[PDB]
Design an enzyme around this catalytic site. Structure first.
Site: not given
Ligand code: FAD
Ligand code: FAD
Ligand code: FAD
Ligand code: TPP
Ligand code: TPP
Ligand code: TPP
Ligand code: MG
Ligand code: MG
Ligand code: MG
Ligand code: NA
Lengths: 585, 585, 585
Positions: A51, A113-114, A256, A386, A471-472, A475
């Site tokens: 994602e 869950f989740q 740089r 980068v 790059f690192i 540095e």
């Molecule tokens: C690994 C890495 C290293 C980098 N190293 C460097 C470096 O050494 N040197 C370098 O130059 N860059 C470097 N950069 C890029 C840097 O981090 C900055 O993003 C960049 O320098 C800023 O560019 P900018 O001012 O064009 O853009 P922006 O920060 O986006 O600023 C745009 C500006 O334009 C203004 N503006 C927008 N529209 C208008 C308009 N119509 N009229 C007038 N003003 C307007 C905005 O208000 C803002 O003030 C690096 C990037 C990376 C990924």
């Molecule tokens: C894709 C996926 C699907 C899942 N589906 C399911 C499902 O269908 N069914 C299922 O069962 N699980 C499922 N799980 C797991 C689920 O999400 C929970 O994590 C699980 O059910 C909770 O287990 P638990 O109660 O053992 O653990 P925990 O949530 O860690 O709870 C532990 C409990 O033990 C207590 N405790 C700790 N130490 C002691 C001690 N010394 N004495 C007494 N109490 C103590 C804690 O206070 C807490 O209340 C799934 C996980 C995934 C990744």
């Protein structure tokens, strides 16, 4: 009369013009899935394998098109996987809507869950962050989230209990406001402020115009202003390509991921016109410590005077304001400063061409990028990951206003090369799309190489395998007292990874192998994705921020070791050209 | 006299007995790296390829050993990548320390590169969440975080500005409190409460003892109580293996990752003794709607009466309390209820063996698991991912108190199979370790198969390739009105993925191929990791929660289609055995 | 050459024009107190008695002047007391800077006295929320906070470790960007969208113009458009006074803090021009369920189409758009709709004058506000608390464009009456200032009546003592099944409270005592604060949202009882006037 709430949520996305969205299903989002399944002819679902790639592709959609990107994750781990793509959209200020699954309202807060309170998880990244609790208001909540993410250029997150999209609501309980949509008003330049700025600019002896991506609609005025007034140009790295890289007075970016001419000229400049620029290195690198006057143009009042004491700040659109300066000026004759910088850019481009043009031997990153340039179409799009690839792509690719290139600019998350290229090919099926990524960055999202095969998205993937986090390592070389750790690692054969996802691939390790492999690749990618794994050397790229070339400032031993390490025997410092034209350093 | 603060932070981890930790370097954490590099003979750094695998392996360390797991991420995207492993540690309540890189204090709040307020990001997952601001107190802050994560069984997160570990502090500015460490006091059972509980238990006609992992140190008393009093046993799925699966009156777990005997018996039971159990399905599935008396034993006062109206709740250690019941009782003779459940468990195990024992034909998940059982050593450890593998492993693996098995129990994040197996082999280099994962779960963390090669960790990886998210497809079958979406996808050949990371691998798709491949695998894994990709059918596992077997409750047409689909012609409902021994349903 | 960091912070506030700020000292903010002590000639520190009064007066400063309000609280309890004033600034979208004390950097995260992680406390209320960790960047962090609070019209919070302001920094570690702050020159509204809106408004048979405070600069144009085209006007309650209340076709506001003509006409209107308005009851009260075309003018893209399906939304400044409409329309002769509405307003205001003009008897709230109207200056400012006073002041005060009135509009926190009057008099020492508050609201912040005496702020405080939370009792009368609870309570004699803080005061309970007491109060308030405690009846004010006056919708028995209870025998439903001018209901 009635519609399911999930069906009305998909109609609001269709009204807002969303063509595709990304995610992975789960029981906690199966009612949204059910609505998508019914609408599969009108809106297209891209199933990803992790994602974070869906959130990164959604941010890249908004970076490329200006239209809101859409992604989703199931409850718990589905949504937390989205974070590196959502922080990228916040930091690069582009609109993204993220939908998060949640257990049904009858089981919420029962600790089942989740099931957890999911609202605190997204509070820091999102501009709008709400758990929906009613089915009849849910179309409005989605509409509201899209309006806000657009108006505020950030992330809107909605957690949806799985039972609400299966409830029936009336077809009059809802509307979309997509037909009322407008982009924010652009402020106009005050003429007196423009006159005062122009007078300071013309009085300067060593002027520079330094622009960011805020000057995107002003490339013509930037170039024209540079050649009418004889003022060199420099940009932030994201702004590369606004003015063609072949332009003779384009110096490159600073710090740089930088080019030597921009770093050398910035240290000498007396007046900088900072246009649409929020360069994050200004204060920590003391970039403007020698500047006498600093002039600023920006649309956002929070940026005015932010990066340096500003003498004249104009709150206005970059293009309108540069058209207004250009209407008040006339052609000026050549100056020593103009000529000194032109000669310095020429010397630098000849050093880059000499690295690019080696014809035989152990493959370095420089020749790989030369081979990309050779097969690249004039309007190609580049998704860049980068690491050293930002430094090397910035020096070697030759871009024009017809190209697009995207990376994670400020959050700088590795892994963006593959999702950016998937989003690019979905939006521009007719343009050639490249993914340029280091081996550490490509292995973080490698499983989604299968998404380019599954959805037939012909991307040219180029992996730079140095078996390092290069790059690192550089540095640690610079700061660390003890030996290297965590920066040299085991090989991954990416032509075998690509074979496992059933994509054509090649692995190369010699300069003379490149022309035929890139020719074949260019032909495959008319129809299918292809991957080239380039096994490159561990050589450090020349550090433009730690130049050892000027005899007035470095010892002969440091200078000779610098030239030998970086094959830089022919580079000359800017002071040579300054002295040829009678200026001092 | 002086020590660097980063060196004192590594000495606090060594005092607390940490042997290994996980992460990926970056400029914002290079001073911690520098301290680790100097200490590489005393503490061992595992470089992973994606930081979520480092946080998941750190949580699995604590699940397996009871000792705190340690991981780190660089500023911004390094730390946000940790989230699926940190929420797993919070939800499975195990101690984890996470260190987060941050820009130096002189650049904080300047909006520089990859610099943001990182403290709000970790506020919801962590028990302790602080940004360190002083180098002389930083050893204490790390010490404090470890004490709290142990005492509170959760996550401690510390954001560290990169300049503080390079500052010198005095060697008297710090100590570790590791030598004062104690685990929480176990409360003792009140004798009167135990007598009252025992009297209700003995008066029951259809008793069940239902235990969770809180009864981990009480497997002997559980089995002994079951056979002295003639009471069947059932558990939560994580508690499988506390009592040997071969025990004749072990019914299995309930709900969906469940076994048929436990679901059938729970619906008939009149008294349930719920011991160390926090089953998250109790209320949403109405699991105890027919229970007459519910008796509870737990150590935590927040769980008493939580899951159901509780008649007698004892706040005490599970083992001490079961030893006290066992001291008050005598052997009882066999009952109809005992015999009815024994006959039902026998009928179910014969159905599972018949699926396992097919000798030729298209490979199903059942025979793969039979082949794992055949090569498994008596003390093998299983790291299981999330999806149908939890359902199938629960029915088919035969575990004893000598085995360990771990998954993400409650947060249920996919991708845990590979990091859990890396942590297992690091902690138990002499035990056989398996990673059982579906194809959707193994592709989310597939890049870290290279970490098993790089650190020479011999894991037997088994991938179940059905080209589906099978667990979600069956949910859509059950709930969704429209057709399947996002659950059937393209093939990934994992024997080719493994070849690309330079690990031995096999791909199989027929039942008759299994004995020789698993024999070879068992031999390779004495020295090297190996992967088996098993291409299995799309057959749905029998749903133990939607049984169609009883003619009193389902039509002949539903029963026959159920038996044909699940090859269940020989299963009998529990009502057959209840009627053979004279009881009613 | 050097300056203490705390002295440079107070210089950043002075540069931004901050004249006064509010707070209470403590050990964790004593280094900022030390710097303020030295600058008491340039910035005025107001010591309040409870920190929420400081935060509420800072939000009232920004509401009145448009300049950022500033407040502070000490660590722990000083800063959490600010919360009701900070949420009011967020909800009423006005700029506020809040400084929060923190323990020194050497003691942070040591769990020492009153030391805690304070950053998570302010994360939800604040647009910008940071803990400063370095003294040399602290002036820039304060400048950054002020720039973001103005640009985002919200709250900025900075937590300051107390050791950092006493550290020395260089006189050029800092600058303020106050000099770069400016207002945008916005484009003119597009003539084609303006012409479409004008054509639709002219075709309407029953139009209404419904404006909010976004039309605050368009009072002239609203009134002229209204009488040229014969279109009645209605507003949100905070927009009262933008058009003088005496204007004959001003209908008042809708819902409960409302006037009868506005509610009746909104239900009959066919076309509504919604201008600079974000009326929060729109959807929940189905205010526009009978509207045929809904037209909108707003400057914020996030509001377009938000409150109702909108036919034409123009993104533009309200005053420029209304001026553009006015420039293309000419006189329409009086219509039936115009005349029915004017007649209905006349009848309503005769009802209100009869309540106000009672000359003897038990004092009701109505005659107290008539006495306020008699001694009020044409430019008086009113600070109004929350409860029945919003309803009564909305009907009885007669405001013009020269007046200002403020309350907590959307967060609606009680207690704002006293802090708003303190802030008004600090900003405008020459204007008459009233604090109108009910007894529940005045007792929440009563202790800060001493701040008016201590700083010599001549406010006229009028407390409406009914010994009830009258606004809530009427809600319980409408919704609750059981008896009234928590809404009737013990007397507090506020003239004795005023005497305890050494303020002149009077307590009145008869209508005939009003003229002399208010005449004396007007004269005392030329030099000193004064308080009048008016003991009023518990009569419910007429519910404009529950009218029972039309025989077609209510029974004659209900109409009789409503007329009797609200002394409303001479009020007519709007349907009388509709039928009289030939329109149907
Ligand atoms: C690994 C890495 C290293 C980098 N190293 C460097 C470096 O050494 N040197 C370098 O130059 N860059 C470097 N950069 C890029 C840097 O981090 C900055 O993003 C960049 O320098 C800023 O560019 P900018 O001012 O064009 O853009 P922006 O920060 O986006 O600023 C745009 C500006 O334009 C203004 N503006 C927008 N529209 C208008 C308009 N119509 N009229 C007038 N003003 C307007 C905005 O208000 C803002 O003030 C690096 C990037 C990376 C990924
Ligand atoms: C894709 C996926 C699907 C899942 N589906 C399911 C499902 O269908 N069914 C299922 O069962 N699980 C499922 N799980 C797991 C689920 O999400 C929970 O994590 C699980 O059910 C909770 O287990 P638990 O109660 O053992 O653990 P925990 O949530 O860690 O709870 C532990 C409990 O033990 C207590 N405790 C700790 N130490 C002691 C001690 N010394 N004495 C007494 N109490 C103590 C804690 O206070 C807490 O209340 C799934 C996980 C995934 C990744
Ligand atoms: C006890 C209590 C009860 C209340 N009851 C009621 C009630 O019954 N009826 C009622 O009306 N109110 C009531 N209120 C107030 C109510 O809560 C809202 O605050 C109010 O209705 C919203 O007013 P608004 O739309 O004018 O202001 P805001 O909410 O501030 O909105 C201003 C709007 O104007 C826009 N705007 C700003 N500048 C411009 C520009 N230059 N050009 C164009 N557009 C612009 C903004 O973008 C925004 O949309 C009550 C308050 C209290 C304290
Ligand atoms: C997710 C994430 N983790 C860590 C970092 C820190 N980081 C920045 S560049 C880099 C290494 C890049 O390695 P690779 O992709 O191999 O490129 P190379 O420099 O070798 O070309 C790292 C680890 C980051 N930006 N994002
Ligand atoms: C990171 C994450 N995303 C989504 C889910 C929802 N989910 C639970 S099981 C499952 C599918 C499991 O697929 P696979 O690993 O192929 O196993 P199968 O059921 O096919 O054996 C999904 C997507 C989850 N638990 N975690
Ligand atoms: C701090 C706070 N608590 C509770 C409320 C809810 N509330 C709204 S109006 C009201 C009562 C107002 O009482 P009073 O000030 O006496 O005015 P009355 O209506 O009696 O004139 C209350 C409790 C609120 N808005 N603010
Ligand atoms: Mg690399
Ligand atoms: Mg699968
Ligand atoms: Mg009252
Ligand atoms: Na991955």
């Amino acid at each position: 009369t009635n519609i399911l709430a999930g069906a009305a949520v998909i109609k609001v996305l269709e009204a807002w013009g969303v063509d595709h969205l990304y995610g992975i299903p789960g029981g906690s989002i199966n009612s949204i899935m059910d609505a998508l399944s019914a609408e599969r002819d009108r809106i297209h679902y891209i199933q990803v394998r992790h994602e974070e790639v869906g959130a990164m592709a959604a941010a890249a959609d908004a970076k490329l098109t200006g239209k809101i990107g859409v992604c989703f994750g199931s409850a718990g781990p589905g949504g937390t996987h989205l974070m590196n793509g959502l922080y990228d959209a916040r930091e690069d200020h582009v609109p993204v809507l993220a939908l998060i699954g949640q257990f049904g309202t009858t089981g919420m807060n029962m600790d089942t869950f989740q099931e957890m309170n999911e609202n605190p998880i997204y509070a820091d990244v999102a501009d709008y962050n709400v758990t929906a609790v009613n089915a009849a208001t849910l179309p409005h909540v989605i509409d509201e989230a899209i309006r806000r993410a657009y108006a505020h250029q950030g992330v809107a997150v909605v957690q949806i209990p799985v039972d609400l999209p299966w409830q029936q609501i009336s077809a009059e309980d809802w509307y979309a406001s997509a037909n009322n949509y407008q982009t924010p008003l652009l402020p106009e330049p005050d003429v007196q402020a423009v006159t005062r700025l122009t007078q300071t600019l013309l009085a300067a002896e060593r002027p520079l115009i330094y622009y960011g991506i805020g000057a995107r609609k002003a490339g013509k005025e930037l170039e024209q202003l540079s050649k009418t007034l004889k003022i060199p140009l420099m940009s932030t790295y994201p702004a590369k390509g606004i003015v063609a890289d072949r332009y003779p007075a384009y110096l490159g970016s600073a710090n740089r991921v930088a080019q030597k001419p921009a770093n050398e000229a910035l240290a000498q400049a007396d007046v900088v016109l900072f246009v649409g620029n929020n360069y994050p290195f200004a204060e920590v690198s003391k970039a403007f410590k020698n500047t006498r006057y600093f002039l600023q143009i920006d649309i956002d009042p929070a940026k005015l005077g932010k990066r340096h004491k500003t003498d004249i700040a104009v709150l206005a659109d970059a293009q309108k304001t540069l058209a207004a300066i250009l209407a008040q000026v006339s052609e000026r004759e050549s100056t020593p400063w103009w000529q000194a910088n032109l000669a310095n850019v020429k010397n630098w481009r000849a050093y880059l061409a000499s690295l690019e043009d080696k014809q035989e031997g152990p493959l370095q990153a420089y020749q790989v990028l030369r081979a990309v340039n050779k097969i690249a179409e004039p309007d190609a799009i580049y998704s860049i990951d980068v690491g050293d690839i930002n430094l090397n792509a910035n020096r070697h690719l030759k871009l024009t206003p017809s190209n697009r290139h995207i990376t994670s600019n400020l959050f700088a998350t590795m892994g963006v090369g593959i999702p950016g290229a998937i989003a690019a090919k979905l939006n521009y099926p007719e343009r050639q799309v490249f993914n340029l990524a280091g081996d550490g960055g490509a292995s973080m999202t490698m499983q989604d190489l299968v998404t380019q095969v599954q959805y037939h998205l012909p991307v040219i993937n180029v992996v730079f395998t140095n078996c390092q986090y290069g790059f690192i390592k550089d540095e640690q070389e610079d700061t660390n007292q003890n030996d290297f750790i965590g920066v040299e690692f085991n090989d991954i054969d990416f032509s075998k990874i690509a074979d496992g996802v059933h994509m054509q691939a090649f692995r190369v390790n010699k300069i003379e192998q490149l022309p035929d492999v890139f020719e074949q690749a260019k032909a495959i990618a008319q129809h299918e994705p292809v991957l080239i794994d380039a096994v490159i050397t561990g050589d450090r790229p020349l550090p433009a921020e730690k130049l050892r070339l000027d005899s007035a400032m470095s010892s002969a031993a440091d200078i000779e070791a610098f030239k030998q390490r970086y094959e830089a025997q022919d580079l000359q410092p800017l002071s040579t050209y300054l002295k040829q034209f009678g200026l001092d350093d």
